[PDB]
């Protein structure tokens, strides 16, 4: 199956510069226009840019040219998007696409049949900041709701699994906060019917934070 | 958003769902139209491309046609899974660039009144022994996605140190939380703090207690 | 700047390639010589395959391709390019003696029978693009060109956009195609034997360019309407062929490397080509640079004129592509 996986995304100040990296697999990666197209959060698609090779056309659009450069290394199915003069409207998530196949060098239609994940990307003057991670213990047959709180972190995003992903039913983690300090806070709930273990793994990756928190009663 | 979409589409379950794109002579006037859906959460996925060319996969109910600066996608038999947003994309020949449309946000109408589910957590003594301590109020499962809370020191409420989410579509009811911020004196010193939760009227309680 | 006039010095102008614009260069070269009686024009028809191989190698001052040059022909060899000369067109002709109409076919049907799902030619997903058509029960015999074709680079970037998932996977485009090897099908050499062997046996199926559609017809063979991506069907002739090149005039690039295969037109022919001189930038002499660049020059303007054009079905360059000509044209030196 294809697979496009965007990564390098996280925090950077206003004016600073970030490069963005697309892996592609299950294809013939020099076949296609490749493609970035990002969001803003909560909003639409925005295009970005697409290329071929640097011996074909290559396009930006207008709110990023002159500050962003496509590039791809065809060797290691590998696209690259750097970004520089950073603004705070380049907050977004930014996906990696697959195009129209290769034809020829100047055709560039919205062909998009493969998408990644996207990676986020925060232009921002505040500070990176770690959460702490807090168990979320019931006090008192039935089933139980048992959590995690990821308190006073910033940016987003912030991924929680349980038990490193063997307890996937009955787990909602929910939408941050944003509080009026500007730091998020985000909770992971899981639903269960004193002798299995309950572990939350949380994982902040603009401060480099990862931590495993039991929730006990 | 240069192509131009309704922001709100809606349908009744069975129905066809028209979702028309308007553009003008330089991008959907010249080059193919393309389609997307997107889900809360996900990537885009293609839906349509050359103006009515359906992938292998998507289903024969939706569809798509074009009439010279405008293009329309119809998403017949209606169904719940289909609630998502649509984008419309053609290449602009003027810029040399992607034009999107502004995306529809398509609602399946039908969805019967859910009252909130609300869990309610104390402070963690982990927290308690770094000076702080936080309330965590968890709303889900409800509908419409409308709701107010209230905090409550007892019997009288609390304002301060209080922070809501919008709430927020899962994947299709509405989720929302709300967290309360105390001191841990301020934690103990009352008897008990109550969360709650105010949907078409009607509230739903939770309450925790220091003892 | 162009060249207007050639060299005062005798010079030989050799060509080879295309078999879709060989009869039109017929026409080019003695009348460029009947004018300019030092200019001696050869030409051969070869297939474009030939036209690009013996341009790039230097054996020919004029390779015709009806298929542009890939990056990596660029990149392999140094001051090779493709100068749009005119716009051409590629039919599809079949062999069904019982049937007046102009068959409806599109991509996806094409590819079944050049894969061989489509076994017959009275098969449901042919009846559904010609309700009420007295199809027959007769074979479909698909033929394919033998030798490295322009035409056959169009046709087949024209199933791989019809058809991205199945023939676009595989097995592609290129003037050169591992086409499957279904019961009947055959290799034919040039246009001419794509004429006669689809005329051979009735039921074939057959890609021939526009230069030959008089003597296909005169053969008694039938021409479709192929269809777009829009979803409709077009013959090829002046408007739908002018309506899809006119689809791609503006965002023609400067190097003129451009597919126009399956325009986004709805009244464009799915099927419209550039007719290419694979010409160098750097020739053997500066006589020989002045009059290439002089008879290139007199092509894409009097060479363009309807009474050269229209002995081959041919369209001109519209006057945006003419200027993109002329810059490369500018350019041949010595």
Same mark, same amino acid.
């Given at each position: 199956?294809?697979?496009?996986?965007?990564?390098?995304?996280?925090?950077?100040?206003?004016?600073?510069?970030?490069?963005?990296?697309?892996?592609?697999?299950?294809?013939?990666?020099?076949?296609?226009?490749? %493609?970035?197209?990002?969001?803003?959060?909560?909003?639409?698609?925005?295009?970005?840019?697409?290329?071929?090779?640097?011996?074909?056309?290559?396009?930006?659009? &207008?709110?990023?040219?002159?500050?962003?450069?496509?590039?791809?290394?065809?060797?290691?199915? +590998?696209?690259?998007?750097? @970004?520089?003069?950073?603004?705070?409207?380049?907050?977004?998530?930014?996906? *990696?696409?697959? $195009?129209?196949?290769?034809? &020829?060098?100047?055709?560039?239609?919205? #062909?998009?049949?493969?998408?990644?994940?996207?990676?986020?990307?925060?232009?921002?003057?505040?500070?990176?900041?770690?959460?702490?991670?807090?168990?979320?213990?019931?006090?008192?047959?039935?089933?139980?709701?048992?959590?995690?709180?990821?308190?006073?972190?910033?940016?987003?995003?912030?991924?929680?699994?349980?038990?490193?992903?063997?307890?996937?039913?009955?787990?909602?983690?929910?939408?941050?906060?944003?509080?009026?300090?500007?730091?998020?806070?985000?909770?992971?709930?899981?639903?269960?019917?004193?002798?299995?273990?309950? !572990?939350?793994?949380?994982? %902040?990756?603009?401060?480099?934070?990862?931590?495993?928190?039991?929730?006990?009663? | 958003?240069?192509?131009?979409?309704?922001?709100?589409?809606?349908?009744?379950?069975?129905?066809?769902?028209?979702?028309?794109?308007?553009?003008?002579?330089?991008?959907?006037? +010249?080059?193919?139209?393309?389609?997307?859906?997107?889900?809360?959460?996900?990537?885009?996925?293609?839906? !349509?491309?050359?103006?009515?060319?359906?992938?292998?996969?998507?289903?024969?109910?939706?569809?798509?046609?074009?009439?010279?600066?405008?293009?329309?996608?119809?998403?017949?038999?209606?169904?719940?899974?289909?609630?998502? #947003?649509?984008?419309?994309?053609?290449?602009?020949?003027?810029?040399?660039?992607?034009?999107?449309?502004?995306?529809?946000?398509?609602?399946?109408?039908?969805?019967?009144?859910?009252?909130?589910?609300?869990?309610?957590?104390?402070?963690?003594?982990?927290?308690?022994?770094?000076?702080?301590?936080?309330?965590? *109020?968890?709303?889900?499962?409800?509908?419409? $996605?409308?709701?107010?809370?209230?905090?409550?020191?007892?019997?009288?409420?609390?304002?301060?140190?209080?922070?809501?989410?919008?709430?927020?579509?899962?994947?299709?009811?509405?989720?929302?939380?709300?967290?309360?911020?105390?001191?841990?004196?301020?934690?103990?010193?009352?008897?008990?703090?109550? *969360?709650?939760?105010? %949907?078409?009227?009607?509230?739903?309680?939770?309450?925790?207690?220091?003892? | 700047?162009?060249?207007?006039?050639?060299?005062?010095?005798?010079?030989?102008?050799?060509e080879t390639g295309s078999t879709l614009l060989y009869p039109l260069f017929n026409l080019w070269g003695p009348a460029?010589?009947?004018?300019?009686?030092?200019?001696?024009?050869?030409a051969q028809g070869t297939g474009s395959g030939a036209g690009?191989?013996?341009?790039?190698?230097?054996?020919?001052?004029?390779?015709a391709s009806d298929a542009?040059?890939?990056?990596?022909? @660029?990149?392999?060899?140094?001051?090779?390019?493709? !100068?749009?000369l005119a716009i051409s067109a590629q039919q599809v002709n079949y062999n069904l003696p019982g049937v007046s109409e102009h068959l409806?076919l599109?991509?996806?049907?094409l590819?079944? @029978?050049?894969? $061989?799902?489509?076994?017959?030619?009275?098969?449901?997903?042919?009846?559904?693009?010609?309700?009420?058509?007295?199809?027959?029960?007769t074979?479909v015999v698909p033929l394919h060109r033998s030798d490295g074709s322009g035409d056959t680079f169009l046709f087949?970037?024209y199933?791989?956009?019809?058809?991205?998932?199945?023939?676009?996977?595989?097995?592609?485009?290129?003037?050169?195609?591992?086409?499957?090897?279904?019961?009947?099908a055959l290799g034919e050499n040039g246009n001419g034997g794509m004429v006669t062997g689809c005329a051979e046996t009735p039921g074939c199926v057959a890609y021939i360019g526009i230069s030959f559609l008089d003597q296909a017809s005169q053969r008694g063979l039938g021409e479709a309407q192929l269809?777009?991506?829009?979803?409709?069907?077009l013959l090829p002739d002046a408007?739908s062929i002018?309506?899809?090149?006119?689809?791609?005039?503006?965002?023609?690039?400067?190097?003129?490397?451009?597919?126009?295969? &399956?325009?986004?037109?709805?009244?464009?022919y799915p099927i419209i080509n550039?007719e290419?001189?694979?010409?160098?930038?750097?020739?053997?002499?500066?006589?020989?640079?002045?009059?290439?660049?002089?008879?290139? #020059?007199?092509?894409?303007?009097?060479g363009?004129?309807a009474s050269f054009l229209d002995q081959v079905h041919f369209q001109?360059?519209?006057?945006?592509?003419?200027?993109?000509? &002329?810059?490369?044209?500018?350019? !041949?030196?010595?």
């Amino acid at each position: 199956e294809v697979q496009l996986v965007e990564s390098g995304g996280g925090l950077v100040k206003p004016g600073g510069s970030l490069r963005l990296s697309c892996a592609a697999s299950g294809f013939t990666f020099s076949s296609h226009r490749m %493609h970035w197209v990002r969001q803003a959060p909560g909003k639409g698609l925005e295009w970005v840019s697409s290329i071929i090779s640097s011996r074909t056309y290559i396009y930006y659009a &207008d709110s990023v040219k002159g500050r962003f450069t496509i590039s791809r290394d065809n060797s290691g199915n +590998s696209l690259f998007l750097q @970004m520089n003069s950073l603004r705070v409207e380049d907050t977004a998530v930014y996906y *990696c696409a697959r $195009g129209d196949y290769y034809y &020829d060098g100047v055709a560039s239609d919205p #062909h998009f049949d493969n998408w990644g994940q996207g990676t986020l990307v925060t232009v921002s003057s505040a500070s990176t900041k770690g959460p702490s991670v807090f168990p979320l213990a019931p006090s008192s047959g039935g089933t139980a709701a048992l959590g995690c709180l990821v308190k006073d972190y910033f940016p987003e995003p912030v991924t929680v699994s349980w038990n490193s992903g063997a307890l996937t039913s009955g787990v909602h983690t929910f939408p941050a906060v944003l509080q009026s300090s500007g730091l998020y806070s985000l909770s992971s709930v899981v639903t269960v019917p004193g002798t299995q273990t309950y !572990i939350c793994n949380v994982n %902040h990756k603009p401060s480099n934070t990862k931590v495993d928190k039991r929730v006990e009663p | 958003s240069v192509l131009t979409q309704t922001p709100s589409a809606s349908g009744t379950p069975g129905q066809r769902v028209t979702i028309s794109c308007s553009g003008s002579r330089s991008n959907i006037g +010249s080059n193919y139209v393309y389609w997307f859906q997107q889900f809360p959460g996900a990537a885009p996925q293609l839906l !349509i491309y050359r103006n009515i060319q359906r992938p292998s996969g998507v289903p024969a109910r939706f569809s798509g046609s074009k009439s010279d600066t405008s293009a329309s996608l119809a998403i017949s038999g209606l169904r719940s899974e289909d609630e998502a #947003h649509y984008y419309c994309a053609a290449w602009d020949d003027s810029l040399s660039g992607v034009v999107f449309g502004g995306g529809t946000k398509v609602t399946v109408l039908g969805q019967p009144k859910a009252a909130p589910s609300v869990t309610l957590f104390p402070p963690s003594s982990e927290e308690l022994q770094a000076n702080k301590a936080t309330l965590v *109020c968890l709303i889900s499962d409800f509908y419409p $996605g409308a709701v107010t809370v209230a905090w409550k020191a007892d019997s009288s409420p609390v304002k301060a140190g209080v922070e809501t989410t919008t709430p927020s579509k899962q994947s299709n009811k509405y989720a929302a939380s709300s967290y309360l911020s105390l001191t841990p004196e301020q934690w103990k010193s009352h008897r008990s703090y109550s *969360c709650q939760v105010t %949907h078409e009227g009607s509230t739903v309680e939770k309450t925790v207690a220091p003892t | 700047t162009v060249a207007t006039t050639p060299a005062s010095s005798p010079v030989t102008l050799a060509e080879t390639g295309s078999t879709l614009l060989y009869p039109l260069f017929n026409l080019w070269g003695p009348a460029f010589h009947e004018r300019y009686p030092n200019v001696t024009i050869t030409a051969q028809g070869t297939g474009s395959g030939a036209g690009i191989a013996q341009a790039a190698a230097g054996t020919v001052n004029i390779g015709a391709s009806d298929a542009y040059l890939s990056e990596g022909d @660029m990149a392999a060899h140094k001051g090779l390019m493709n !100068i749009a000369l005119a716009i051409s067109a590629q039919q599809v002709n079949y062999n069904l003696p019982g049937v007046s109409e102009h068959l409806k076919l599109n991509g996806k049907v094409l590819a079944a @029978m050049y894969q $061989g799902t489509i076994k017959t030619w009275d098969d449901p997903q042919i009846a559904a693009l010609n309700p009420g058509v007295n199809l027959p029960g007769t074979a479909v015999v698909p033929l394919h060109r033998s030798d490295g074709s322009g035409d056959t680079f169009l046709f087949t970037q024209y199933l791989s956009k019809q058809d991205p998932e199945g023939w676009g996977k595989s097995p592609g485009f290129g003037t050169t195609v591992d086409f499957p090897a279904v019961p009947g099908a055959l290799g034919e050499n040039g246009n001419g034997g794509m004429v006669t062997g689809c005329a051979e046996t009735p039921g074939c199926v057959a890609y021939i360019g526009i230069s030959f559609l008089d003597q296909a017809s005169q053969r008694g063979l039938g021409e479709a309407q192929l269809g777009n991506s829009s979803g409709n069907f077009l013959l090829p002739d002046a408007q739908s062929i002018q309506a899809a090149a006119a689809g791609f005039a503006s965002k023609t690039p400067a190097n003129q490397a451009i597919s126009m295969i &399956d325009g986004p037109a709805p009244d464009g022919y799915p099927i419209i080509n550039y007719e290419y001189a694979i010409v160098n930038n750097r020739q053997k002499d500066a006589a020989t640079a002045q009059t290439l660049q002089a008879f290139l #020059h007199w092509a894409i303007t009097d060479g363009n004129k309807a009474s050269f054009l229209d002995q081959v079905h041919f369209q001109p360059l519209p006057p945006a592509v003419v200027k993109l000509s &002329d810059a490369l044209i500018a350019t !041949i030196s010595s």
